[PDB]
Amino acid sequence: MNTVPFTSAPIEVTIGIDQYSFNVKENQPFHGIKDIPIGHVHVIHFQHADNSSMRYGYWFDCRMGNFYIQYDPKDGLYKMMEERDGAKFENIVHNFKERQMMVSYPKIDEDDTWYNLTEFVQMDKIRKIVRKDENQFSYVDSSMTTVQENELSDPAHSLNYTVINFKSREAIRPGHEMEDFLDKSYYLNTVMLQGIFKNSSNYFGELQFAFLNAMFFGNYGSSLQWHAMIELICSSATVPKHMLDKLDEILYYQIKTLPEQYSDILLNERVWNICLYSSFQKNSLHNTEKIMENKYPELL
Amino acid sequence: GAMNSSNYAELFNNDIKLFVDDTNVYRVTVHKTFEGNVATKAINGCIFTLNPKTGHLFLKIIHTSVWAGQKRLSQLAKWKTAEEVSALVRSLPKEEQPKQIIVTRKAMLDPLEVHMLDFPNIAIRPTELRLPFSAAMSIDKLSDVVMKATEPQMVLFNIYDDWLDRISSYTAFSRLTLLLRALKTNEESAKMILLSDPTITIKSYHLWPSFTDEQWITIESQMRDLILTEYGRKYNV
Ligand SMILES: O=C(c1cccs1)N(CCO)C1CC1
Ligand SMILES: O=C(c1cccs1)N(CCO)C1CC1
């Protein structure tokens, strides 16, 4: 169980850690988050009280270094940093724990939610989507655009998700125009799985990461990417059975966790109605279709 | 964007463009089987691909053999149309290729777009008008070559005959659309108007009769009446 200490909390802010969040008042004696479960990536995220605009945060894995948060009054945000002096870090954390100035990661023992949302997500792959190689952690915020979004403007600050485009030469083999457009199995299995992602685990990891950035930061290009990756599977007549079963579990837990009051902006009516009721896989997502019908029957 | 009344003169500028109409590609007669069920029998069809500035009509005849053993024919028909249009474009010299293709039905947009991926600088556009190009099979010489075909075939026509020697493209297209509206609205009466006078003939190399300028004004007036009456008489007025 690892710790992310905070130097201080000089501005009032709602701090999230994975699916949890808490309010910190201006100059309250808050010095971080302890008992963070080892074995998963995590995200620590921020919404200032004054400017609910710009949610931002950091993806990190405590196995990869000792990380802390420190407010920068010039750039006006809480920054993640790595501490290379390991004894200095342990000494800081031990003192803050002794003075009980840290909140505890509040995981219920039965609760597998975070594992289920991050099962295939790996820091190494996050760091290729979010390019900033001098840091072991990755910054994301509400405004960052995706590479595909930029083709339709600062390249360094982009989300380099895999470009999916159903009306593209990559998607459509010469001579198979109708076949490949109506049944995307070629594009899913050969171009994307065999060619680009190498296996279904990396595909799922990018799909899960896209969802999480959509949910936690309201990142619109991430939401587009999540729905595109869902639609590509559902619109393929030929998908390995293990992938369909896993997708149903993945989406089930995403829909379960989504705040009910954000469903109007975060769920695309067309993709979901197509996937659940018209696509090749309309009968292959039993858990997802049941939670969608009981939680968001309006959308459908 | 979409082609509509507001940008109508764009049809007659100097950017090459084609209309594509797929209405008559997949054509069937519906009939009873011996067991009392219903079945279709396909008949020959055509793609109607028209340059509105020059009158050049690329009439690709769709022979019934192309449907043999295929499923979801109304869907296939749209993709076949897009395949043939794409093949036509690739057959033309670069300087004759269109800069825009306007489809008369929105369901043709994705099939054509996918088939034209090799041509990113050709705009594929819908139209908001309900253009009456389906009535092309009421033109006797067009219907005749389609029904006689025994194999796939492309036949080239100028749908304006020699009109462009005396009128502008804008006027020629307007006359064509009016004639097609007449033929669509009431085919028999429309055809009566056009052939009633035995002294006005259709030249061997033309589709329509050789009306003088004055006779065309009379003819066009008669087509407006027939269409006006029927629009009145159909909305019962
Ligand atoms: O008759 C028309 C009308 C125009 C304006 C009112 S009716 N046609 C065919 C021309 O003969 C076309 C819109 C111009
Ligand atoms: O039945 C007609 C017409 C009748 C007479 C002139 S137009 N329409 C035109 C729409 O108003 C139908 C849409 C095809």
Domain hosting A239: range is 116-299
Indicate the pairing of strand A103-104 with strand A32-36: parallel
CATH code (residue A151): 1.25.40.550
Q: Break chain B into its structural domains and give their ranges.
A: 9-163, 164-237
Tell how far the Cα of B231 is from the centroid of ligand 2, in angstroms.
6
Cβ contact B117–A181 (<8 Å): no
Rounded-to-integer distance, Cα A184 and Cα A191, Å: 10
3-state secondary structure of A95: helix
- Resolution in angstroms for this experimental structure? 1.5
Rounded-to-integer distance, Cα B19 and Cα B214, Å: 30
Q: Is A108 on the interface with B (CB under 8 A)?
A: no
| Rg over CA atoms, chain B | 19
Tell how far the Cα of B181 is from the centroid of ligand 2, in angstroms.
9
Q: Which residue ranges have their beta carbon within 6 Å of ligand 2? A: B 130, 185, 227, 230-231, 234
CATH architecture label of B9-163 = 2-Layer Sandwich (3.30)
Q: Which of A178, A179, A180, A182 would best serve as a mutation to test chain B binding (most B beta carbons within 10 A)?
A: A178
Cβ contact A169–B117 (<8 Å): yes
The dihedral region occupied by B69, where left means phi > 0, alpha psi between -120 and 50, and beta the remainder, is left
Q: Using a 6 Å cutoff on CB, does residue B174 contact ligand 1?
A: yes
Cβ burial of B200 (10 Å; 0-12, 13-18, 19+) is: middle
Rounded-to-integer distance, Cα B127 and Cα B3, Å: 4
Contact list in A for residue B110 (CB cut-off 8 A) is 167, 181
DSSP at A141: E
Tell how far the Cα of B194 is from the centroid of ligand 2, in angstroms.
21
3-state secondary structure of A70: strand
Q: Which atom of ligand 2 is nearest to the CA of B230?
A: 5
Q: Using a 6 Å cutoff on CB, does residue B178 contact ligand 1?
A: yes
Rounded-to-integer distance, Cα B50 and Cα B222, Å: 25
CATH of region B164-237:
1.20.80.40
Are B104 and B131 a contacting pair, CB within 8 Å?
yes
Nearest Cα residue to B207 out of B139, B135, B155 = B139
Cβ contact A178–B111 (<8 Å): yes
Q: What own/partner pairs with CB < 8 Å and gap ≥ 24 does B3-12 have?
A: B3/B102, B3/B125, B3/B126, B3/B127, B3/B128, B3/B129, B4/B127, B4/B128, B4/B129, B5/B128, B5/B129, B9/B170, B11/B52, B11/B53, B11/B169, B11/B170, B11/B173, B12/B52, B12/B53, B12/B168, B12/B169, B12/B170, B12/B173
Cβ contact B79–A178 (<8 Å): yes
Cβ contact A177–B76 (<8 Å): no
How determined? X-ray
Indicate the pairing of strand B45-50 with strand B56-62: antiparallel
Rounded-to-integer distance, Cα B54 and Cα B164, Å: 8
Pocket of ligand 1, candidates B163, B174, B175, B223: which has the most ligand atoms within 8 Å of its Cβ, to mutate? B174
Nearest Cα residue to A248 out of A201, A278, A291, A209 = A291
Rounded-to-integer distance, Cα B48 and Cα B155, Å: 11
Are B124 and B103 a contacting pair, CB within 8 Å?
yes
Tell how far the Cα of B162 is from the centroid of ligand 2, in angstroms.
29
Are B213 and B166 a contacting pair, CB within 8 Å?
yes
Q: Which atom of ligand 2 is nearest to the CA of B231?
A: 5
Rounded-to-integer distance, Cα A223 and Cα A211, Å: 6
Are B63 and B151 a contacting pair, CB within 8 Å?
yes
Contact list in B for residue A168 (CB cut-off 8 A) is 117
Cβ contact A177–B83 (<8 Å): yes
